[PDB]
A paper describes a structure:
Proof-of-principle demonstrations of the practical value of the flow cell for SSX data collection were performed using microcrystals of the integral membrane protein cytochrome c oxidase from T. thermophilus. This enzyme belongs to a large family of terminal oxidases, which accept electrons to reduce molecular oxygen to water during cellular respiration. Considerable biochemical and biophysical data, including a number of resting state structures of T. thermophilus CcO, have yielded insight into the function of this enzyme, although structural details concerning the mechanism of redox-linked proton translocation remain elusive.
Data were collected from LCP-grown microcrystals of CcO at BioMAX using the 3D-printed flow cell. The sample flow-rates were adjusted to achieve a similar velocity for the sample as it passed through the X-ray beam, and were 0.3 µl min−1 for 100 µm- and 1.2 µl min−1 for 200 µm-diameter glass capillaries to give a downwards velocity approximately equal to 0.64 mm s−1. Serial crystallographic data yielded an SSX structure of CcO to 2.12 Å resolution, which compares favourably with an earlier SFX structure determined using XFEL radiation (SACLA, Japan). The peak height of the F obs − F calc omit electron density map was 1.15 e Å−3 for the SSX structure and 0.97 e Å−3 for the SFX structure. We previously modelled either a water molecule or a hydroxide ion as a ligand to CuB, although a heavier ligand remains a distinct possibility. In this work, each exposed microcrystal received an average room-temperature X-ray dose of 40 kGy, which is well below D 1/2. Nevertheless, studies of X-ray induced damage at low temperature suggest that metals such as iron are sensitive to an X-ray dose as low as 40 kGy, and CcO from T. thermophilus has been shown to be radiation sensitive. Our structure does not show any signs of X-ray induced damage to radiation-sensitive residues such as glutamic acid residues [Fig. 3(c)].
Numbering used by the authors:
A (entry chain B): 2 to 168
B (entry chain C): 4 to 34
C (entry chain A): 9 to 562
Write the structure that this text describes.
């Protein structure tokens, strides 16, 4: 029948479509796996549970003195202890050299904040009681804006920070 | 043969590819 | 009438639908104001005069997300995925449980609503700790969602009774869809129920001092992905089993329809880390595994695209359409019940494309928590699911009320559905484009008018969308109340059968359907996948709990 011929012709093309579909998704998985094997994967947060007490992080430890928050931990590597709080970032500004690997260690003494550096793939959630660790290397010197992109209360839309990358 | 259906899945496929490859490029430009 | 005595499930279904549409209206009021905000126009001083209980942008955003995305979507799912299988089997659901489910939904909604309206739960529809809402918000939300466990029972009951009266027969298609839908939702729902019962309820009552925000988010997104397939599948049921008849054709494949719904049972729940790519404390290995599984959840929709397009082309040909594109012109573009879901499917193409980008792990760092994400999801739920619901008013409402649709109400419906679709498409351009310029989501940006100058052009699209969708909503309100409050009635509209489509069958079809009818086996497989996908991470997190104090920052 006309309809029997349609069922058969429709399923025939539908089987090719499904084969093409899977092939396409497999190619996407290969192209993602590639990004995980390059330097660009440093923006993925460390999977380690690094617990802190949000009630003492401003009183004791590496977040307590923002002026000593940038530390040389390697020959071309700096670790930055960043506090995201209602409603700002410390230190402000963050001052780092061009071309060095920057390990950002970010926590909150209050609620969840975002840490999104305009012009980069640095885009990480900051949970109180937890440390978010991400790595990045700035190629160009200048001013990069930090945007809080997680709703943190009525000050959210004004919560901005500054990274200065020096030649 | 379902030419019309094939035209729709051609438009879907190109939309997926322009979106995915566009952002893949943006990811490397910001990396 | 005597109709509600024979078919009392019609009265209960109507109560679900109307409560759903009322929630959609109140939630949607805030939309145009949010679009004007993403256009750098602050209209909130005007809104506060109209609705003086509104204290802030974020309180409006909470009402917007909760009423549209949680309340309206659930009530629509409860109406469609109980009533359609009941009518396919010609069997009466347990009307005691059915009324109980409605009263639970109604009480939970009133209780959740009070603190929302009084500015005591300005925490948004994700309510991420340690932002601490009033206990009534979490209690109300909990009772509202648990309504659906009664709905699961009602349909497993209908199916059990049917199989007992018909041993040896395969489940009918619509009942098959509803059964796998409700079993998927049972597995899905456990994340949020565990979060509410173990953490949010004791915390909000003062019985525990803190909550671990990483465990809270992990449990939330267990439910938080599959809840969007919970929104979607009632629209898919209508698009598969009803749209084809309305278009003048048939469903080209029963087995291909069943396969798509089975794949959603297996793959909808074990993927939630695609909401946690930017979370600390979750192993990248598990992120890559949830990413891969997320790309597989896309397959049923890739399949749906072909089966439905093939079904509409078939209808076009039957009606004398010729060529690559003549089948399109031959379709009933004068019928709002046809147009609404089809425009929804057109917007779903770019919508699905954005979803696949979002799913691809490292690509999410480009768009996470930007205006991109609301751009993506308005095409999925605010356009396809909502337009398919709006279209149902033209065939479902008469079937429940005996109230006919006048030709004028039909013409108004075509205008509403076109303006709604066009507004969502314009807003999608503005939000996708603002997102790639790093404009954040969930932000009163109109209060920092100098912060995002690079986004001036996309912001014009957001104002235009704001105005178009304000007009579409006002027309929708006028039209809905016109149909409800109209005095004319024709009872034997209410006695008519639903426009269920016929199916084309093949020699192949019976073997595939028996394989898929082993629902006990398939549910077991789905349950194990949840255990494998979540179990190891939850053991790690529960071993290292770090509860933190709550904050009110509004
Ligand atoms: C109903 C509601 C939704 C659906 C459906 C949905 C589908 C997907 N989404 Fe999504 N989504 C994500 C990935 C996906 C993927 C891979 C799919 C897939 O299921 C999509 C597959 C779809 C397709 C492949 C399209 C098929 C096309 C069809 C079927 C059209 C055919 C047309 C025809 C037949 C017309 C022909 C007619 C003619 C006349 C020619 C990710 C990441 O992986 C995030 C987190 C991002 C971040 O950073 O926060 C996310 C975020 C969201 C959020 C925000 C949560 C929040 O508030 O934080 C919501 C509400 C949402 C809703 C929905 N989403 N999504
Ligand atoms: C007139 C119709 C609508 C307009 C103009 C509109 C506009 C918006 C805009 C601009 C946002 C983003 C605001 C922000 O991130 O701060 C938003 C958020 C949202 N909208 Fe809509 N919307 C409409 C209808 C709907 C419908 C029908 C649904 C669901 C059925 C929906 C679900 C959502 C959700 C879930 C959010 C996110 C809430 C959150 O981030 O906490 N919207 N809406
Ligand atoms: C670079 C990408 C650009 C390309 C975009 C999309 C191309 C794929 C579309 C459908 C896949 C093919 C579907 C049909 C395969 C043929 C087949 O299966 O034959 C049917 C039948 O047996 C014969 O009589
Ligand atoms: C029928 C034909 C059968 C043949 C099938 C072939 C399909 C292979 C597809 C993709 C290749 C993946 C390429 C991986 C290389 C990545 C390179 C890249 O993206 O590099 C840009 C960036 O600048 C770096 O830092
Ligand atoms: C129609 C309704 C839907 C509306 C969608 C609007 C946006 C459309 C597609 C975005 C695809 C991403 C395109 C990204 C362009 C950027 C690019 O290619 O630039 C590479 C460059 O190297 C980096 O700086
Ligand atoms: C729609 C138009 C999409 C416009 C795409 C803008 C691309 C962009 O923002 O550039 C990428 C990257 O940030 C460069 O540093
Ligand atoms: C609060 C408690 C009252 C909850 C129940 C009060 C009355 C319940 C009666 C009932 O079954 O109502 C079904 C429906 O309202 C038929 O129109
Ligand atoms: C009907 C349900 C009543 C449940 C309990 C009713 C009253 C119990 C709440 C008392 C209260 O204020 O507890 C919240 C806490 O003090 C602030 O963190
Ligand atoms: C609709 C669902 C109803 C749920 C009720 C909330 C459960 C509250 C009771 C749970 C027990 C709390 C408890 O005993 O907390 C003591 C804890 O050890 C302190 O350290
Ligand atoms: C279904 C199974 C499909 C196959 C998937 C399994 C492959 C896992 C590899 C990702 C792990 C490598 C990621 C490590 C990156 C670490 C990093 O950059 O952290 C900072
Ligand atoms: C940015 C906004 C973009 C708006 C896009 C619209 C696509 C519409 C494509 C489908 C066409 C539907 C109308 C049609 O084909 O009408 C047939 C005619 O009425 C029978 O004689
Ligand atoms: C500045 C640019 C302005 C923004 C563009 C959209 C606004 C106005 C157009 C009005 C559209 C009204 C809807 C008409 C479509 C319709 O009803 O067509 C029925 C037809 O029979 C097939 O279904
Ligand atoms: C109605 C349709 C308009 C689309 C075109 C709107 C885009 C035109 C530019 C508007 C604009 O704001 O121009 C940029 C800048 O603000 C000035 O110097
Ligand atoms: C029709 C067009 C509707 C949009 C008209 C207002 C657009 C707008 O906001 O204009 C701001 C302007 O670009 C800067 O002063
Ligand atoms: C009340 C909640 C009832 C939830 C029932 C779902 C569990 C269940 O029955 O799963 C096994 C299934 O019946 C396999 O055929
Ligand atoms: Cu910090 Cu928003
Ligand atoms: Cu999801």
């Amino acid at each position: 029948v006309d309809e029997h011929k349609a069922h058969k012709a429709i399923l025939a093309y539908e089987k090719g479509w499904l084969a093409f579909s899977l092939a396409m998704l497999f190619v996407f998985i290969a192209l993602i796996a590639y990004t995980l094997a390059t330097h660009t994967a440093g923006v993925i947060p460390a999977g380690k549970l690094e617990r802190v007490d949000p009630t003492t992080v401003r009183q004791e430890g590496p977040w307590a003195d923002p002026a000593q928050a940038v530390v040389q931990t390697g020959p071309n590597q700096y670790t930055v202890y960043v506090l995201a709080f209602a409603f700002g970032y410390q230190p402000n500004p963050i001052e780092v050299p061009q071309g060095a690997e920057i390990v950002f260690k970010i926590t909150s003494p209050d609620v969840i904040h975002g840490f999104h550096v305009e012009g980069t793939n640095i885009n990480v959630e900051v949970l109180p009681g937890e440390v978010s660790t991400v790595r990045y290397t700035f190629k160009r010197p200048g001013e990069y804006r930090i945007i809080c992109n997680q709703y943190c209360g009525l000050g959210h839309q004004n919560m901005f920070g500054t990274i200065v990358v020096k030649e | 043969k379902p030419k019309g259906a094939l035209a729709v899945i051609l438009v879907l496929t190109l939309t997926i590819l322009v979106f995915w490859l566009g952002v893949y490029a943006v990811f490397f430009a910001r990396g | 009438s005597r109709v509600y005595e024979a078919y009392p499930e019609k009265k209960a279904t109507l109560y679900f639908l109307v409560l759903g549409f009322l929630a959609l209206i109140v939630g949607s009021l805030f939309g145009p104001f949010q679009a004007l905000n993403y256009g750098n126009v602050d209209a909130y001083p005007l809104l506060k005069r109209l609705l003086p209980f509104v204290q802030s942008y974020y309180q409006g955003l909470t009402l917007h997300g909760v009423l549209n995305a949680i309340v309206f979507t659930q009530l629509f799912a409860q109406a469609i995925m109980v009533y359609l299988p009941a009518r396919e089997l010609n069997m009466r659901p347990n009307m005691g449980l059915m009324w109980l489910s409605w009263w639970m939904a109604f009480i939970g909604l009133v209780v959740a609503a009070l603190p929302l309206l009084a500015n005591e739960a300005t925490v948004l529809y994700t309510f991420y700790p340690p932002l601490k809402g009033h206990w009534a918000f979490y209690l109300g939300a909990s009772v509202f969602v648990l309504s659906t466990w009664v709905s699961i029972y009602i349909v497993l009951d209908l199916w059990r009774r049917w199989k007992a009266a018909n041993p040896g027969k395969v489940t009918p298609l619509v009942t098959y869809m509803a059964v796998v839908f409700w079993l998927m939702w049972f597995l899905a729902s456990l994340g949020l129920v565990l979060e509410a019962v173990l953490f949010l309820l004791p915390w909000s009552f003062g019985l525990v001092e803190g909550v671990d925000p990483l465990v809270a988010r992990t449990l939330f997104w267990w439910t938080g992905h599959p809840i969007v397939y919970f929104w979607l599948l009632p629209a898919y049921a209508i698009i598969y089993t009803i749209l084809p008849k309305q278009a003048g054709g048939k469903l080209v494949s029963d087995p291909m329809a069943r396969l798509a719904f089975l794949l959603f049972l297996l793959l909808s729940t074990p993927v939630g880390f695609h909401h946690q790519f930017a979370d600390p404390g979750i192993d990248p290995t598990w992120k890559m595994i949830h990413s891969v599984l997320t790309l597989f959840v896309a397959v049923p929709s890739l399949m749906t695209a072909f089966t439905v397009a093939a079904s509409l082309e078939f209808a076009g040909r039957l009606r004398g359409g010729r060529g690559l594109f003549g089948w399109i012109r031959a379709l009933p573009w004068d019928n709002p019940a046809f147009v609404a879901p089809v425009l929804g499917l057109l917007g779903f193409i770019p919508g699905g494309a954005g979803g696949i980008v979002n799913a691809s792990f490292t690509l999410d760092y480009v768009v996470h928590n930007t205006a991109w994400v609301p751009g993506h999801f308005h095409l999925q739920v605010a356009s396809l699911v909502t337009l398919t619901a709006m279209g149902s008013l033209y065939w479902l409402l008469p079937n429940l009320t005996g109230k006919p649709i006048s030709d004028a109400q039909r013409r108004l419906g075509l205008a509403v559905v076109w303006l709604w679709f066009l507004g969502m498409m314009i807003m999608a351009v503005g939000l996708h484009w603002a997102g790639l310029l790093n404009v954040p989501r969930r932000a009163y940006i109109a209060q920092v008018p100098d912060a995002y100058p690079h986004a001036a052009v996309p912001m014009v699209f957001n104002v235009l969308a704001g105005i178009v969708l304000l007009v579409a909503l006002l027309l929708f309100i006028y039209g809905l109340f016109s149909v409800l409050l109209s005095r004319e009635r024709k009872p034997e509209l209410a006695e008519a059968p639903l426009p269920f489509a016929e199916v084309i069958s093949g020699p192949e079809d019976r073997r595939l359907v028996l394989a898929m009818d082993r629902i006990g086996f398939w549910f077991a497989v789905a349950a194990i996948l949840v255990v494998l996908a979540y179990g190891p991470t939850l053991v790690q997190l529960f071993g290292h709990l770090n509860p933190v104090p709550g904050w009110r920052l509004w």
